[PDB]
C-alpha cells in the first residue's frame, strides 16, 4: 500500500474514543413534573438563576 490513510475512522477507534470520555448527566433532559412557577427562579444565591 505504502501511504494508505483512511478517509473513514474505523469502528474500533470510534469505540475507543467513546469509551474514554464520560457523559454529562444533564444531557438526558428528562422532565415529568412541570415547571416550578414560584421557586425555581428564587433558589439559593450560589446556584441562583
Amino acid at each position: 500500500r505504502m501511504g494508505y490513510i483512511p478517509r473513514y475512522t474505523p469502528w474500533e477507534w470510534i469505540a475507543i474514543q467513546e469509551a474514554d470520555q464520560p457523559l454529562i448527566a444533564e444531557q438526558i433532559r428528562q422532565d415529568n413534573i412541570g415547571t416550578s412557577y414560584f421557586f425555581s427562579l428564587n433558589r439559593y444565591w450560589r446556584y441562583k438563576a
Binding site: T35, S36, Y37, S40, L41, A49
Partner: protein, 73 residues
Amino acid sequence: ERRLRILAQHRVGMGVLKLDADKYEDQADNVTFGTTKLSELLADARKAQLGEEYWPSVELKVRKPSGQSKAHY
C-alpha cells in the same frame, strides 16, 4: 386567536407563536421563564371567551367624506 395575535405582535409569525427566552444564563431557567410567559400570554388571550367586550376591535380604514358629501359643505 385574534387577541393572541394582537397581544403577541411580532412573536407570532406564519401561524406559529415563537418565544425566544434569553433572560437567564442557564437554559433550564430560560425554559421555565418561557413556559411562564407562554402561560401568561395564553391566560390573557383566553379572555375573549368571557364576552364580546374582550373581543378585539377591527381596525377599518374609514375614508374621509367624499366629494359628493363635500359638495354639500
